[PDB]
Amino acid sequence: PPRFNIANVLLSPDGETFFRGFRSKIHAKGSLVCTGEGDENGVFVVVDGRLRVYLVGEEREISLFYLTSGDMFCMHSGCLVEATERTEVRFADIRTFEQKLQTCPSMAWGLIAILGRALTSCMRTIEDLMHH
Amino acid sequence: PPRFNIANVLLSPDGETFFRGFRSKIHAKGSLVCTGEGDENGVFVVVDGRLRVYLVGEEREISLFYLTSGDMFCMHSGCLVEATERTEVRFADIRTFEQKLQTCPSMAWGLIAILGRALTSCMRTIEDLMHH
Ligand code: HEM
Ligand code: HEM
Incomplete structure (x- = not known):
């Protein structure tokens, strides 16, 4: 998929409200945003900081890619997500996020882009x- | 990502024409639909049949996942695609696909979906x- 700059959405009149009311969370460096398990479910977006998405097995870690500011991810991919810096996220459950998406579909390309990026990595x- | 039913769109007044003008092509069981070094850029949707997506090096083919009626995909993933049975596709080029997407955002969900499964399969x- 094409690259996606999240600011073309947030600066636009359709987009600016997109994350209104999304909760805010801060993640200490070294802390796990996601383990490959029952973290919960939900979508978040990186406000600032940096997170590492990786897999394990044979007790060995493989880095897939990194999530910096403006990147979207979820709590249910079964990948591991750990903060490499103190990072802030906005989060909401799957359902609210779905709602927002259908009210501002242009913001769907961000989701498309992050899957493209995680796809090319794995390959x-x-x-x-x-x-x- | 969420599961996507392409009929929801094709039956909508919004999307019924989405593939208007796309060209039709028939691949016979066993034929390659994609190489890596073919350098043609495009999207296609499966009408009927079944395609296998896989990668290669060191003379070891590895299967990732399959494509069936309704699934979307592209000619630039570097992935290799072969028809495991007689499969009819509709195709056009990235540009034309984009336009149709601009005009009918709901269809992007099928893109999110196919990228989605590809991701899980590769993991x-x-x-x-x-x-x-
Ligand atoms: C339909 C299923 C699609 C799949 C599975 C897919 C997958 C991929 C992958 C794996 C790459 C990595 C490139 C590489 O291997 O070097 C890529 C790149 C790219 N694709 Fe797609 N893509 C799809 C649809 C699209 C669409 C609809 C567009 C345009 C509207 C698009 C435009 C691009 C662009 C511009 C790049 C290069 C991005 C960059 O600058 O790094 N693709 N795609
Ligand atoms: C943002 C990046 C996302 C990624 C990388 C992602 C990836 C995944 C993966 C890997 C799975 C399968 C987990 C498994 O292996 O059991 C999955 C399942 C699922 N996710 Fe997502 N997801 C994302 C966002 C979303 C969003 C926005 C929704 C909104 C509805 C969603 C809804 C679902 C649903 C309904 C399933 C299971 C249903 C099915 O069989 O397809 N996910 N996702």
Whole structure:
């Protein structure tokens, strides 16, 4: 998918309200936003800071990609998410987020972009796990 | 991401024409739909049939997931696609797809959906490839 700048949405009259009322949470460096389990469910967006999305297995970590400011992710991918800096997120449950999306579909490309990014990573990862 | 039913859109007045003008092509069981080094850019949607998506290196094919009636995909994922049965597709180029998307945002959910499954499939592939 194309790149996506979240600001073309937030600066626009359709977008500016998108996160109104989303709760705010701060994540200490080193802290786990998500474990591959029952964190809960919900979507969040990185306000500032930086998070690492990775997998394990054989007790070994594979980095997939990083989530910096403006990036959207969820609590249910089954990936691990840990803060590498103190980072702030806005969050809401799946349902509120769905609502907002249908009222401002242009903001759906951000979701498209983050899946594209996480997809290309995994694929490149897979190529590399084979070249040995 | 949420599951997507393309009929919801195609039956909507909003989206009934979405594939107007797309061209039709028939691939016979066994034929390659995508290479890596083909360098043609485009989107297609499966009308009927079944395609397999996989990657290759070191002469080891690895299957990721499959595409069936209603699923969308592209010619630039670097992924390799072969028809496991007689499969009819509709296609156009990225530009034309974009336009149709601008005009009918609800259809982007099918993009979110296919990127979505691709993601989950590649992850287990990784989870798998490691207990190995
Ligand atoms: C329909 C299913 C699609 C899939 C599975 C997909 C997947 C991908 C992947 C894996 C890449 C990584 C490029 C690489 O391997 O080097 C990519 C790049 C790209 N794709 Fe898509 N894509 C899809 C649809 C689209 C659409 C609809 C558009 C445009 C409207 C698009 C435009 C682009 C662009 C511009 C890039 C390069 C992004 C960059 O600058 O890094 N793709 N896509
Ligand atoms: C924002 C980035 C997101 C990513 C990377 C993502 C990824 C995933 C993954 C990997 C799964 C399967 C988990 C498993 O392996 O069991 C899943 C399931 C699911 N997610 Fe998401 N998701 C995202 C956002 C969303 C959003 C915005 C919604 C809104 C409805 C949503 C709703 C669902 C639903 C309903 C399922 C299970 C239903 C099905 O079988 O497709 N997710 N998602």
